[PDB]
């Protein structure tokens, strides 16, 4: 239900006494939160709408040269000068050319020569500032139960119904309480100022395409620019980055414009993240949050209901959702209305012992009609298993085999934890932390390592990371001394940082 | 204003705060209430279920002065290094603000 088929779904379980759990909501990812006696609630960060942007230094990328002019002065007769040099919309450059009696002088030598050129930018790009107090994170919430595959497990959430909730997260309202009808309320305690460090990220505007341009990259662009606080003719500081004053044969100085720098800055933007803009607000498609989930008010609906009588029907044949969980759909045929489906996993079904755990806690049919659909989710153990979704002789079972093992599960969890550490950095220790002396000491020493690594190297590309990793590998394979752990921690910390892409 | 009582509810978060180049956060609030001389319950707290005061307060003993409907106030708090919340109320109608 809105998070069951996404490949970046992780499972967080267990709380500190059923009170709170700490989680990190990725922007492309989803988090499925399950508990013991509380219903399974899916979280999905959908958007990041940044409003109220003010402009910064806006660069030009397509220039033009108007009617140019040039004039020389005789040698030992002063320096050349024009009245059109007294405007800021004219670029110029002084040079020394040959001058003779065929050139009209009366003294042979290297006379001064000034060539003016009226600058006129046609199309310019714009950088905008991102304030950290203007982030608006939208969080979709959906609990597992009483849903179909149609308008209940899709994006139909533009209303106020049960089992679906949306909340906006500002820094002015960092906590939220989504109202789930019958299920209680999930308490969010998000920390939106600890996003993707938005004090050093700008917002580019070029050709109706937008990026999350880093600030230190944006402050060092060699292009003509004005300060952005102008609604007329711009001043265009540093006009000499797109014009070229080329002496042909020391007889005539021609000035030509350079080409449009659109493709030269699209190739220079090899590290920004593309965003969109739906007006004056900037919708992002990336980032991460930091939320604590108060789960004390989340209650389970449908525990007092009775069982179903009989007649379950197997429609929408179940498949594996790329993690080991099996989305199982049923069509219950009966007129009980509010009944409870006795769904369970079972190995060696003559004993009917529940062995595999269940994701959708307390599955409930709501509709009082004859044909009633339901969308479940079950996780089998590694080996042969049956899906018993009925009671009595009219149960329907399903032969299911989750391919894998326990140590393969732990190896895949180690790979997922390494990718989660390579994406988040310091915040990856608070993804399933319930509060302890190891998830706050490990996060502290990883914060020390991140502050000592992002300040030290901090600027390596994807290829240069592997290029210095080969050097650190060769320095780890030799120089047998006490400093061999420095050549292996900074080897793996760059190699897994560069290879997990 | 040590003899004043605490506030009841209904604060308003105007003038979204910032850092004054030293780690201090100057926070403006608008107490929507006619209680008069009440004392503002401001504290800096991580782990919002506990509300443990971790950061010290610069403007000691903040006091609402005006007895009208919307009495303004300007405070200053020193959060610790890391993540924190500016909890400037009591009860259930309190408003908070995350600060890093």
């Amino acid at each position, epitope marked *: 239900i809105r998070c069951i088929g996404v490949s970046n779904r992780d499972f967080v379980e267990g709380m500190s006494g059923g009170t709170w759990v700490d989680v990190v909501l990725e922007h492309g990812g989803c988090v499925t939160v399950m508990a013991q006696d509380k219903p399974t609630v899916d979280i999905e960060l959908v958007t990041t709408t940044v409003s109220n*942007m003010a402009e910064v230094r806006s660069y030009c990328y397509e220039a033009s040269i108007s009617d140019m002019a040039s004039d020389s002065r005789c040698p030992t007769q002063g320096e050349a000068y024009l009245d059109k040099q007294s405007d800021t919309q004219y670029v110029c450059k002084r040079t020394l050319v040959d001058r003779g009696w065929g050139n009209g002088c009366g003294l042979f030598g290297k006379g001064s020569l000034v060539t003016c050129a009226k600058f006129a930018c046609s199309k310019k790009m714009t950088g905008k500032s991102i304030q950290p107090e203007n982030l608006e994170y939208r969080i979709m919430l959906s609990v597992h139960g009483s849903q179909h595959s149609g308008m209940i497990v899709n994006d139909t959430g533009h209303e106020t119904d049960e089992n679906r909730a949306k909340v906006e997260i500002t820094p002015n309202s960092p906590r939220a309480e989504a109202t789930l009808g019958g299920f209680g309320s999930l308490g969010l305690d998000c920390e939106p100022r600890t996003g993707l460090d938005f004090s050093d990220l700008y917002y580019l505007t070029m050709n109706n395409k937008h990026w999350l341009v880093h600030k230190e990259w944006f402050h060092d662009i060699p292009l003509p620019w004005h300060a952005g606080a102008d609604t007329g003719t711009p001043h265009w500081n540093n006009k000499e980055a797109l014009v070229e004053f080329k002496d042909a044969h020391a007889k005539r100085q021609t000035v030509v414009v350079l080409g449009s720098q659109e493709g030269a800055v699209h190739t220079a933007l090899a590290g920004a993240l593309e965003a969109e803009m739906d007006g004056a607000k900037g919708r992002l498609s990336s980032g991460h949050l930091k939320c604590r989930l108060k789960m004390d008010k989340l209650r389970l609906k449908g525990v007092s209901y009775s069982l179903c009588t009989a007649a379950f029907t197997f429609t929408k044949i179940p498949a594996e959702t790329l993690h080991g969980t099996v989305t199982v759909e049923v069509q219950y045929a009966g007129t009980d209305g509010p009944c409870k489906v006795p769904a369970q996993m079972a190995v060696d079904m003559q004993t009917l012992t529940p062995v595999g755990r269940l994701i959708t806690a307390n599955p409930v049919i709501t509709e009082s009609t004859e044909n009633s659909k339901m969308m479940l989710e079950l996780d089998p153990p590694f080996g042969d298993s049956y899906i018993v979704i009925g009671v009595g002789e009219k149960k329907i079972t399903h032969h299911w085999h989750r391919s894998g093992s326990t140590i393969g599960k732990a190896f895949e969890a180690t790979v997922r934890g390494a990718k989660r550490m390579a994406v988040l950095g310091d915040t990856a220790w608070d993804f399933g932390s319930v509060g302890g002396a190891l998830n706050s000491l490990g996060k502290g020493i990883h914060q020390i390592f991140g502050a000592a690594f992002k300040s030290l190297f901090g600027g390596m590309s994807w290829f240069s990371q592997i290029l210095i990793g080969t050097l650190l590998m060769w320095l780890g394979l030799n120089t047998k001394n006490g400093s061999i752990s420095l050549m292996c921690l900074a080897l793996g910390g760059v190699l897994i940082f560069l290879s997990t892409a | 204003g040590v003899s004043y009582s605490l506030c009841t509810a209904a604060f308003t978060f105007t*003038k979204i705060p910032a850092e004054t180049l030293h780690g201090t956060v100057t926070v403006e609030v*608008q107490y929507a209430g006619t209680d008069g001389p009440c004392k503002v319950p401001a504290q800096m707290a991580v782990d919002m279920q506990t509300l443990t005061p971790v950061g010290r307060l610069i403007t000691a003993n903040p006091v609402i002065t005006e007895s*009208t409907e919307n009495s303004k106030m300007m405070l200053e708090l020193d959060p610790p290094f890391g993540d924190s919340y500016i909890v400037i109320g009591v009860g259930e109608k309190k408003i908070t603000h995350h600060w890093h």
Partner: antibody
Amino acid sequence: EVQLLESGGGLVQPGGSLRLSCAASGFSFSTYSMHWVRQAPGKGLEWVSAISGEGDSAYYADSVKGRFTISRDNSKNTLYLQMNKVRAEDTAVYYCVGGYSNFYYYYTMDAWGQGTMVTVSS
Amino acid sequence: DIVMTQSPASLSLSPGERATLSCRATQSISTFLAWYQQKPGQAPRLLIYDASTRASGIPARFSGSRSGTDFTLTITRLEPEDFAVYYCQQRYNWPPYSFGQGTKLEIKR
């Protein structure tokens, strides 16, 4: 109390130059920044120009930039809005706004004058 | 480029009811707004400093609020000696501050 008297009345002929002299007295006007707000008949208010606490600095609006220059005498606490190149769009009621400024141009409590009937007729 | 627009400009209401006047902005002016009170033929006064606190000699029946770039007035009881023209003012960054347009208040007759 708040006493911002204005002077320099009459009419402004097209092509000349006059001075609107605000006789500001009753406060320490060496720190109070001074402003000038129009009042167009039938339309809203217009912001014209202002003088900062420091003597050298002075700003105007973009529609009246380079035409109306002001001067403050610190020994007199007065203003002189030089009405150079007056066109037909200056038919309004000028005022004098004075407020305290820690920075260049700011006020927390504003003061006002009584107005000056300045029209253009040929 | 920040033009203070007022919506609405006239409300045919009775003295004693409420009145909400809003001033808008284009860029991100956070809170620094100032309302004014101008009777025709008299000197203009203010209404509220930072849309929350009035001047010396102005009662607390007139207040404002902050909502993004819009600032709505909250008037408890309208008096017949209070219907005049009201303006807004910019006090963000560097001047010239931009005034609104002028909001008059009409009565039934």
